[PDB]
Design a protein around this nucleic acid. Structure first.
Lengths: 189, 325, 146, 75
RNA sequence: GGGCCCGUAGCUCAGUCUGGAGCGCCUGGCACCAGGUGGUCGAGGGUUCAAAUCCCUUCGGGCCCGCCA
C-alpha cells in the first residue's frame, strides 16, 4: 500500500500500490490485493456520487494492483483533530450519507480523513455494499474504538460532536446507536 | 525469596503453580478438560477445577511444605465466570488458612508477563489467542490496552467448532493442523479485517455452507486455517504499525499450531523485528503465570486488600493499576 | 512517439463513407468532450489498458465514452452536425476528413462552458461534488471495473 | 423457593477460615440470580438461598457445593 | 442488438408447466440442538376457475455471439 507522489505536468498523481504480504499464501495474496484495489477504487469513486469529498481517481490497474489518484497536500485527521474539534462534526456529516446509501467503510477511523481545504475520505481499502444493520453497527464500533485508542483524553466530546454531525445528516441514527449499545456489550456472561 | 502460590481457573485448563521473585518457577502443573463438544441447559463444566485443585494443591504440598509459601495470587480475570469463582475461592481459602496476603491477577497480563520472563522481550505487543479470548494488547500510557479483538468468536473456539463439524475429536488443534497439511484448493471464504477487530462468524458460516456441498475435507481445513491465521496476522501487523513497537509476542493455547508461528516469523522477517512464543508450560493455562504476576504486583508495594479481591467475569485489561513499568 | 492530432471543427457534416475510406482516426461530439484532458486520458488508457473493443481507433471512442458498450456509445458520442472533434495521426487523412466534412479549424472549443457543463453532466450521469473536468477524467478512469 | 444448606467442619478455626474465604466470593458475584445469605455459626456454616427460579437456584447451590468442597479439601 | 439462468421474508434458496425451510430468535441454559410471531414474490400489460407461476414489454446487474463506425 506504498504511496508515491509525482507531479505530472498537468496531473498531481499519487500512485498507491498494494505490496504483497509474505506471511500470506501468494494465491490468496494476489486474490485479496486484486479484489481490494478493485473495491477501493470503485467505492472511493462512488462516494463522489454522494457529494462526499474524496480524491479523484486518475487511473487504476488490477493486474498491477495499483491506483493512481489525485494527490492532496494535507495533513492527517488525527494530527489536526487535536487542535480542531469541528472535523469530528464533519466526519459525522460525511459518514451520515455514506451510511445512508448503505455503503460501509469497515475501516472508519480518525487517521484517514485528510484536512487540506476540506475533509477528504481517502481510503476505502475495505469498502463494502451491504444493507445489514450489523455491519453498520460494527463499523460504528470500530470507529468508536479507534477514537478511544487514539484520543481517550477527549473521546467523550469527540464522539458527541461526531454523533451530532451524523444525526444532522443521517436520520435513522437512533436504531444504529441502540444496536451499537447492544453489540458493544457482547463480551461474556 | 518471597514464595508465592498462583492459581489458574480462567478456562477449561486448571493450573496450579508456585514461583519465586528471582525469576524461576518452583512448580507448575496443568490439567485440561475434555467436554462432549456441546450441551443443552448444561451443568457447569468448571467443576473440574473444584475436583483437581485439591489434588494439584496436595501434590504441591508433597513437593513443598504448605507453610513454605509467602503470598498467594488467583486468576481474578478475565475468563469463564464459574471457573474464575472456583479459583478465587480456593485462593482465598489457602490465603487465610496460611494467613498470607492474597491478590487477584489479570489472566491476560499474566500471559504477557510470563511471555516476557521466558524470552528476551522487554515490552512487547502481545497477541493473546486462546479458546475463547483472542486480542492484541499493548503497554501504552502505563496500561495494558486492548487494540484489536474479535467481535463474534475467538480463533480457538472457531477451530473447535470447525473440528466439531469435521468431527475431529477434541482437541482439534493438532488434528486440523495436520489435516490441513495436504489441503489443495484454496476454498473461497470471507476475508474480513474490520479496523483492528475481526469477525469470525462469516468464516464459519461459509465453511458450513461449503461442507453442505461436501467438498474436500483437507482443502477446506487448509483454507480456513490460512484465512484465520492471515486475518490475525494482519490485525497484528496494523496494531504493531499503530504502536510502532519493535517486539511482538504470541501467547495462548492456539499458539501450539506451528503455522501461526511460521507466519509470524515471515511477517517479522519482512518487518525486520523479532518475535517470541512462550513454551507449552507457559503457553496454555497454568498457575505459574498468576503466581508470577502476583509477586510482581506485591513486590513494588502494590498491596491488595483481601475484601476487594472480588473477581470480574468481564475483567477488561485496562482496569489494572500497572505500576511495575 | 508521434504526437496525435486533435482538432475541434465547427460546422460539421455527417458522412459515413469516411469511415469506409480506411483512415485511422476517430470523430466524436465536440460539445461532450470536456477538454484536451478528456481525449488525452482516453488515448493514454487505450494505449495502456488491455484492448477490449474490436478496433483501436474505435477503442478510442469506447474509452472516451466511458462505456465498454459500442452499440450505445455510437449513439451517445457519435459525430453530430455543427461541431465535432477528430483525433488522428496522418496529415493526408486530416486533409481528406476536413474536405469531406468541412468547417473551421479552432481548438478553442476544448474550453468548457456552462452549457457544456450541463451537457456533460446529463450525458455521463454525474451528480456529486467535484470539478467536472477531473470528475469526467475519473469517470473515464474506471472503465476496467466490474 | 427456599434452600437451606448446612456445612459442618472439623474445628471452629477451619469454619472461620472457610467462612472468610467464601465471604468475599459471596459478595464477588456482580449479579446474583437469587437472594443468598451466607453465615457462620461457630463450627458450622449456613447458606440460605431464596429463589423464584429453580434452574438458577440449583446452579447457585451446586456452585456453593463446589466452592465449599474446594475450600475444605485445600487442607 | 440478439440468447441464459435469473430478480421470492429485511438479509438464505425452492416453491414454475403441474397456476415456506432460512435468520437475534416468541419459544434453553451456561457455540449446541426444538419451537416461528415475522414473504405473499423485479415493475407494467394481456390470460386466469385459482398467475412469480401462461405469454409479452421494460428495468438494473452477472454471463455468450457481440454487429462497426
Amino acid at each position: 500500500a506504498d504511496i508515491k507522489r509525482d507531479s505530472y505536468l498537468d496531473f498531481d498523481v499519487i500512485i498507491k500500490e498494494r505490496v504483497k504480504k509474505g506471511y500470506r499464501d501468494e494465491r490468496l495474496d494476489e486474490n485479496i490485493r486484486k479484489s481490494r484495489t478493485a473495491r477501493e477504487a470503485r467505492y472511493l469513486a462512488l462516494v463522489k456520487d454522494f457529494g462526499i469529498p474524496a480524491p479523484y481517481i486518475f487511473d487504476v490497474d488490477l493486474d498491477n494492483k495499483r491506483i493512481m489518484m489525485s494527490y492532496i497536500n494535507g495533513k492527517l485527521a488525527k494530527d489536526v483533530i487535536e487542535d480542531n474539534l469541528d472535523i469530528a462534526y464533519k466526519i459525522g456529516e460525511i459518514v451520515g450519507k455514506l451510511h445512508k446509501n448503505d455503503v460501509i467503510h469497515n475501516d472508519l477511523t480518525t487517521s484517514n480523513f485528510i484536512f487540506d481545504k476540506d475533509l477528504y475520505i481517502i481510503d476505502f481499502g475495505l469498502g463494502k455494499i451491504s444493507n445489514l444493520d450489523r455491519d453498520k453497527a460494527v463499523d460504528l464500533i470500530v470507529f468508536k474504538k479507534a477514537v478511544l485508542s487514539t484520543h481517550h483524553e477527549k473521546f467523550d466530546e469527540i464522539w458527541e460532536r461526531f454523533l451530532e454531525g451524523y444525526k444532522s445528516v443521517y436520520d435513522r441514527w437512533e436504531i444504529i446507536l441502540e444496536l451499537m449499545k447492544d453489540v458493544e456489550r457482547r463480551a461474556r456472561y | 525469596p518471597m514464595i508465592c502460590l498462583g492459581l489458574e481457573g480462567t478456562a477449561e485448563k486448571t493450573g496450579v503453580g508456585i514461583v519465586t521473585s528471582d525469576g524461576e518457577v518452583l512448580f507448575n502443573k496443568t490439567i485440561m478438560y475434555k467436554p462432549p463438544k456441546q450441551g443443552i441447559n448444561p451443568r457447569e463444566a468448571a467443576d473440574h477445577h473444584a475436583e483437581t485443585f485439591p489434588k494439584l494443591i496436595k501434590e504441591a504440598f508433597e513437593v513443598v511444605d504448605k507453610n513454605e509459601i509467602d503470598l498467594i495470587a488467583f486468576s481474578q480475570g478475565p475468563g469463564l465466570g464459574p471457573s474464575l469463582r472456583v479459583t478465587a475461592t480456593v485462593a482465598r481459602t489457602l490465603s487465610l488458612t496460611l494467613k498470607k496476603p492474597i491478590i487477584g491477577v489479570n489472566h491476560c497480563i499474566a500471559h504477557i508477563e510470563i511471555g516476557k520472563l521466558t524470552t528476551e522481550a522487554e515490552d512487547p505487543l502481545t497477541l493473546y489467542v486462546s479458546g475463547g479470548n483472542t486480542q492484541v494488547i499493548a503497554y501504552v500510557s502505563k496500561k495494558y490496552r486492548v487494540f484489536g479483538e474479535t467481535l463474534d468468536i475467538a480463533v480457538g473456539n472457531c477451530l473447535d467448532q470447525f473440528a466439531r463439524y469435521v468431527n475431529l475429536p477434541h482437541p482439534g488443534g493438532p488434528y486440523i493442523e495436520e489435516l490441513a497439511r495436504k489441503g489443495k484448493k484454496l476454498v473461497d471464504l470471507p476475508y474480513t479485517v474490520k479496523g483492528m477487530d475481526i469477525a469470525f462468524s462469516g468464516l464459519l458460516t461459509a465453511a458450513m455452507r461449503a461442507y453442505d456441498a461436501g467438498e474436500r475435507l483437507e482443502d477446506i481445513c487448509y483454507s480456513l486455517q490460512e484465512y484465520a491465521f492471515s486475518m490475525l496476522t494482519e490485525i497484528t501487523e496494523r496494531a504493531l504499525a499503530h504502536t510502532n513497537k519493535g517486539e511482538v509476542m504470541l501467547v495462548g493455547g492456539v499458539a501450539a499450531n506451528n503455522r501461526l508461528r511460521e507466519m509470524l516469523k515471515a511477517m517479522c522477517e519482512g518487518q525486520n523485528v523479532d518475535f517470541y512464543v512462550p513454551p507449552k508450560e507457559f503457553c496454555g493455562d497454568n498457575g505459574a503465570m498468576i503466581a508470577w504476576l502476583g509477586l510482581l504486583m506485591h513486590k513494588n508495594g502494590r498491596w491488595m486488600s483481601l475484601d476487594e479481591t472480588k473477581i470480574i467475569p468481564n475483567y477488561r485489561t485496562d482496569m489494572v493499576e500497572v505500576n511495575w513499568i | 512517439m508521434d504526437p496525435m492530432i486533435i482538432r475541434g471543427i465547427r460546422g460539421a457534416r455527417i458522412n459515413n463513407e469516411i469511415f469506409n475510406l480506411g483512415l485511422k482516426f476517430q470523430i466524436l461530439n465536440a460539445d461532450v468532450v470536456a477538454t484536451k484532458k478528456h481525449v488525452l486520458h482516453a488515448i493514454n488508457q487505450a494505449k495502456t489498458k488491455k484492448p477490449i473493443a474490436k478496433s483501436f481507433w474505435m477503442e478510442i471512442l469506447v474509452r472516451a465514452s466511458g462505456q465498454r458498450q459500442i452499440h450505445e456509445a455510437i449513439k451517445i458520442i457519435g459525430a453530430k452536425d455543427g461541431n465535432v472533434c477528430l483525433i488522428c495521426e496522418d496529415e493526408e487523412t486530416f486533409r481528406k476528413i476536413y474536405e469531406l466534412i468541412g468547417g473551421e479549424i479552432d481548438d478553442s472549443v476544448l474550453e468548457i462552458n456552462e452549457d457544456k457543463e450541463r451537457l456533460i453532466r446529463e450525458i455521463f450521469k454525474i451528480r456529486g461534488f467535484g470539478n467536472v473536468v477531473e470528475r469526467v477524467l475519473e469517470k473515464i478512469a474506471l472503465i476496467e471495473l466490474k | 423457593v427456599q434452600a437451606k444448606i448446612e456445612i459442618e467442619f472439623p474445628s471452629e478455626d477451619v469454619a472461620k477460615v472457610v467462612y472468610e474465604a467464601v465471604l468475599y466470593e459471596h459478595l464477588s458475584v456482580p449479579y446474583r440470580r437469587s437472594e443468598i445469605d451466607f453465615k457462620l455459626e461457630g463450627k458450622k456454616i449456613i447458606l440460605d438461598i431464596k429463589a423464584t427460579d429453580s434452574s438458577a437456584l440449583r446452579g447457585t447451590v451446586n456452585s456453593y457445593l463446589r466452592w465449599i468442597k474446594a475450600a475444605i479439601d485445600v487442607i
